Amino acid sequence: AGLLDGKRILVSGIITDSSIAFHIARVAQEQGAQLVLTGFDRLRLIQRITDRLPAKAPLLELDVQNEEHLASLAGRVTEAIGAGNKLDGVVHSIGFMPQTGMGINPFFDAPYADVSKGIHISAYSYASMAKALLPIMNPGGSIVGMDFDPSRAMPAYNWMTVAKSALESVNRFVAREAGKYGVRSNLVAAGPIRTLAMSAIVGGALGEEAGAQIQLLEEGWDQRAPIGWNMKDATPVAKTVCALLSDWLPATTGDIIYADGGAHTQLL
Amino acid sequence: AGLLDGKRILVSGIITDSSIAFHIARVAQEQGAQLVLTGFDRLRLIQRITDRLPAKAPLLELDVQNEEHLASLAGRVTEAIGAGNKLDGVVHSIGFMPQTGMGINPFFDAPYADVSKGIHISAYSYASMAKALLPIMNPGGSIVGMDFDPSRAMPAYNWMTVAKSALESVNRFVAREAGKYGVRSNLVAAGPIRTLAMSAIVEEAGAQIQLLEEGWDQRAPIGWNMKDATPVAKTVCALLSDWLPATTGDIIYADGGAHTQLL
Amino acid sequence: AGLLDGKRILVSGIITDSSIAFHIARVAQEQGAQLVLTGFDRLRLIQRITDRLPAKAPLLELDVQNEEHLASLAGRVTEAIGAGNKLDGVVHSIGFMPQTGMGINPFFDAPYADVSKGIHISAYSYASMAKALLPIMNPGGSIVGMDFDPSRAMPAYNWMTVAKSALESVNRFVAREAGKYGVRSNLVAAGPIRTLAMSAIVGGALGEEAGAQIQLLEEGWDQRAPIGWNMKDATPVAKTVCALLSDWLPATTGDIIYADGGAHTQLL
Amino acid sequence: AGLLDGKRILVSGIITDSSIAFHIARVAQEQGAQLVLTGFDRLRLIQRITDRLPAKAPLLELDVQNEEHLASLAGRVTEAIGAGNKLDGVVHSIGFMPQTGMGINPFFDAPYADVSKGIHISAYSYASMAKALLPIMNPGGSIVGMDFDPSRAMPAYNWMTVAKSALESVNRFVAREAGKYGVRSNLVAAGPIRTLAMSAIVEEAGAQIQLLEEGWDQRAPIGWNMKDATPVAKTVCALLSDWLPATTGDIIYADGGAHTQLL
Ligand SMILES: NC(=O)c1ccc[n+]([C@@H]2O[C@H](COP(=O)([O-])OP(=O)(O)OC[C@H]3O[C@@H](n4cnc5c(N)ncnc54)[C@H](O)[C@@H]3O)[C@@H](O)[C@H]2O)c1
Ligand SMILES: NC(=O)c1ccc[n+]([C@@H]2O[C@H](COP(=O)([O-])OP(=O)(O)OC[C@H]3O[C@@H](n4cnc5c(N)ncnc54)[C@H](O)[C@@H]3O)[C@@H](O)[C@H]2O)c1
Ligand SMILES: NC(=O)c1ccc[n+]([C@@H]2O[C@H](COP(=O)([O-])OP(=O)(O)OC[C@H]3O[C@@H](n4cnc5c(N)ncnc54)[C@H](O)[C@@H]3O)[C@@H](O)[C@H]2O)c1
Ligand SMILES: NC(=O)c1ccc[n+]([C@@H]2O[C@H](COP(=O)([O-])OP(=O)(O)OC[C@H]3O[C@@H](n4cnc5c(N)ncnc54)[C@H](O)[C@@H]3O)[C@@H](O)[C@H]2O)c1
Ligand SMILES: CCNc1nnc(Cn2nc(C)cc2C)s1
Ligand SMILES: CCNc1nnc(Cn2nc(C)cc2C)s1
Ligand SMILES: CCNc1nnc(Cn2nc(C)cc2C)s1
Ligand SMILES: CCNc1nnc(Cn2nc(C)cc2C)s1
């Protein structure tokens, strides 16, 4: 009766109970999926958070910037799901851009070392995760990444927008590779969601004007979205990621599904 | 258990067993949906074809160019599904373009009366179907239309491509209206499907319709079987479900990913 | 010294001194072009307007819905420019949508007979003009149409947006045809300009809420446009149309140049 | 009389007589522009090549990865054009992607250190050039970068396509900055050009680079000559002129119209 009954899915990106990945994982488990979770740096925090999910799931360490973590990932994942078992789904819910590349800091003042760390984690890592997990993925499988529509320039998002543009391009290429395994690669372009970092930004953490600009963006989103947009609810986004992990979008790859209330299709 | 369990869906566009709508209806019924089918002109042919679907479904007449058929549609639909029952889903799988606007006929030789009939049936009727069925649709509902990616010009499709461009624009506006009812409006841009309209209605056209399938399969990272409408039908059901709840005025590409690749 | 020195250009769409076509024609003449002007219905009004252009230009009647006017157009144009002379440029600055298809009238209440008149004049006519004038056009030539970005739904524009979406598609096809003559076909997607009809709309002619919605759109345009947007100045749009009529965009066809202050590239 | 009469334009990216920048510079000078040229690494080779341009132009060193070169650029440029003079135009014709990220090497085998060098030179440097030259640019000015349409994935281009996608995003942001100075920022998405970087830097690669030209010419309604950079160079000059005054954060396609057609 579950949308993902008997599916083995890797879910990365859980840091808090407000992370999009926390809701992707919760909905996937509600839908019968058996999960493997990857965490970065704060493994003690991630453990106490992931324990509050509907079901038990092994937690593995994964710094996408660590080439040893990536090289050992498939072996570690196979150990957690059992020899002879493969993944049906992979969720990349990873994004990061240093403070110099987002907020009130002038767009021209982001040092390249920072932008490069940001593009490494936010875009390149999508291809790294794919390279590492495709050898242990089943035909009919699904790789899903989290995107924020970068088609147009926005205030404050700055170099994260640039990283999303790179991620969109990476995805179309990952799909060419994924296809050889009978696996789909897609992105979910979500509307803005109130994660801990996002509430902090809106509160003025990256400067006041950045907070005010994002608040206008969030307000405008809901105004344009024909069915509305509730940034305080990550479940519609999580439900969309599950739809892509399911067998119900079998002919969609190298693509982007917009879980944004339809705001991107409206000007005013 | 099914993806569309206890959902009341209207499905238009069944003419043959090869119609995309025939497969949309078959998959929806396999998925627990209770259907209402609309048909055009050849109602005797349609009833016979639809009797081959997995389950019984009332068949209603609908010429989208007939303003009386549209004006009475909701009342007729309510009669078929029972008073106090509303639709959860609407499938617009309607397209037509006279021969002068699609094929070997030069793009410049399509008379406007023909292009106009084509845009009426292929684009404007998407808004007509919504106007007529939104009053009898439930919050959480879904309106789904069939599209063929018109972003770039292509040989033979000519004015049907122009009509698809109009349909995509109509859809974004239908979504503004649909939203007031808590209903989503979206299109499925399918890869080419060897429906009879495709082969039969649309010289060495045999190798032409074979080559189209082959070229598309190459571009598609996951491939493309022009003889198989089921992946398209599954994508339509995904939009009719509760699993794409924040997607409206949009296009989902059920094309194997061909549109995302240059070669 | 003129961008269009010794070029023979047909310019359609002059109705008032505020028409985009009036400024396209004025800039083209300032740039050395020899013009042929087409007018619709109000030929007495068009004559007294076009007389206030920098130079004399023959005025011909053209109702794009009249198949006789179209069938005789090339012959009439050849008569005005002289036997043995051909056009180097064609400007389609024609658009119309009945009141039922624009404004506060509900989108669902536009009768098809009206939408059809609108798509006939606004989209189909681009291909009609091309069909009629390509036989009398020189290699290196340029067909230019006026567009308003229809990528996203907007309030009030309603069925005119639908017609622009059709026009964009028509253009890509016209370019396939035009190419056989060595002629380019493109559109200029202009930001909103304060023509007589537009000021009337903003004033509340198609209902108050439509006027208010358009005023917000115009305000937002200038806000998003990185170089600003002055709807009261049609010269930047006219200069863009001339750029496409010139030999300086020789490898651009079936395309759209955005003379919108760059507003379409910015979200907020 | 010329399209760029009395305009002071910086032109970067000349390495050979086949470089797009060599033709951009030649056409700009033919059009009355007074140029400042920037070169990377092989300055002896570049000075010799640029001595073949229609007119004398000072050549300055610029490694876009060198923060000292960038920090001193405006001061060095002002010295070459005279105190009290500012730039009206800037041409960024810079691109690089190590072999691991472009060609037969599998997409998954490009080390990040290489992709990062590529994105630094190909995308980030567009913003670096603007940061450095906007303080010495005149209102009405123009910043123009070279792009290759990255909307869809394509064989061999791999991570350079990823870098072009980043460059298009960078451009929209550079335009927000540029706008404060009354300066436009735009990209020219060119069709393929048989520059040496193209043929030489990017087995049966001879028939590969011939077939690319032929396929593109078919798709292009007006055709495409891969051996002719002049139409691209003319499009760059159009953006550097005063004839596209309301276009910024945008892309002009100098590809013969190939991107607007599916076949
Ligand atoms: N929040 C929004 O408004 C929004 C909208 C659209 C898309 N997104 C995207 O959704 C994704 C998830 O982020 P979120 O908004 O849920 O916030 P989040 O902070 O909850 O999650 C981001 C995750 O990235 C992980 N991460 C950072 N560096 C890493 C590394 N080196 N290796 C592995 N993991 C690393 C973090 O540990 C964290 O769990 C990101 O791709 C983000 O860009 C967010
Ligand atoms: N076959 C493909 O390659 C393909 C690809 C993408 C999209 N599509 C679209 O899918 C839809 C169905 O196409 P198909 O291939 O199944 O062909 P089809 O001919 O079987 O279906 C089109 C339907 O439209 C109906 N119709 C025509 N005029 C009508 C009118 N005036 N009133 C009411 N109904 C009318 C026909 O009776 C028919 O049932 C169309 O919208 C088509 O444009 C087809
Ligand atoms: N004003 C804006 O905000 C704006 C923005 C972008 C694009 N446009 C487009 O620019 C074009 C020019 O319109 P405008 O805004 O300058 O207003 P306008 O009223 O000055 O011009 C429209 C022209 O269409 C002509 N026309 C109408 N029906 C015709 C027919 N049957 N045959 C021939 N000509 C016919 C009119 O006579 C008139 O000269 C249109 O395509 C319009 O949609 C306008
Ligand atoms: N040739 C094509 O098919 C094509 C098509 C579209 C766009 N382009 C783009 O046009 C531009 C020029 O390409 P081209 O084909 O003329 O090749 P090219 O190799 O001749 O030019 C690229 C230039 O970048 C310079 N460069 C590289 N690394 C640098 C650095 N660290 N600092 C400063 N300068 C550096 C090189 O010296 C060279 O002058 C590039 O941006 C390229 O991506 C090329
Ligand atoms: C200094 C802040 N750094 C961040 N890096 N990634 C982030 C996650 N994210 N991604 C989008 C898109 C929106 C948000 C908030 S915030
Ligand atoms: C004479 C042409 N008549 C048709 N009208 N609609 C059709 C359905 N259709 N639409 C697309 C797009 C592809 C196919 C097969 S064929
Ligand atoms: C009842 C009003 N009818 C109109 N038909 N064409 C118009 C011209 N136009 N085109 C765009 C785009 C914006 C405007 C004002 S107004
Ligand atoms: C080893 C690869 N190095 C290169 N870096 N930039 C290049 C220029 N370029 N960019 C595109 C796009 C097409 C061409 C020829 S070749």
Residue numbers in the entry:
A (entry chain B), C (entry chain B): 2 to 269
B (entry chain A), D (entry chain A): 2 to 203, 209 to 269
Question: What did the original publication write about this model?
Answer:
Isoniazid (INH), a successful frontline TB drug for more than 50 years, targets the NADH‐dependent 2‐trans enoyl–acyl carrier protein (ACP) reductase InhA. This is a key enzyme in the Mtb cell wall synthesis pathway and does not have a human orthologue. InhA inhibitors are known to modulate the tertiary structure of the InhA protein binding pocket, in particular the substrate binding loop (SBL). Herein we describe the screening of such a library, in comparison with other fragment sets, against the highly validated Mycobacterium tuberculosis (Mtb) target InhA.
Crystals suitable for structure determination were obtained for fragments 4, 9, 12, 22, 24 and 34 bound to InhA. However, the pyrazole rings occupy the same sub‐pocket, stack against the nicotinamide ring of NADH, and the 2‐N‐pyrazole provides an H‐bond interaction with the 20‐OH group of NADH. The 3N of the thiadiazole ring and NH side group of 34 and 45 H‐bonds with Met98 backbone. Similarly, as a result of the deconstructed fragment 34 retaining the binding pose of 45 (pIC50=8.1)14c as well as occupying the same pyrazole binding pocket as fragment 9, compound 47 was synthesized.
